[PDB]
Every structure is written in C-alpha cells, then in structure tokens.
Amino acid sequence: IALSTCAILXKPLGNNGYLCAVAKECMPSCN
Numbered sequence: 001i002a003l004s005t006c007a008i009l010x011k012p013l014g015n016n017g018y019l020c021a022v023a024k025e026c027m028p029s030c031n
Contacts, residue, residue: 001019002019002022006018006019007019007020007022007023007025
C-alpha cells in the first residue's frame with residue numbers, strides 16, 4: 001500500500017477507483 005501507482009491511477013469515476021489525490025504526491029506542502 002501506497003507507492004507507485006496509487007495516486008497515479010486517478011482517473012476517478014462516478015464512484016472513484018483507488019487511492020487518488022493524496023499527500024506530498026498531490027500537495028506541494030502536505031501534512
């Protein structure tokens with residue numbers, strides 16, 4: 001769980017898919 005293709009395979013739908021949009025990966029200054 002969580003390195004690689006996690007937030008990389010976003011392409012969410014009407015019911016989302018996997019762990020998108022997280023963390024320093026998506027945010028420049030996460031917390």
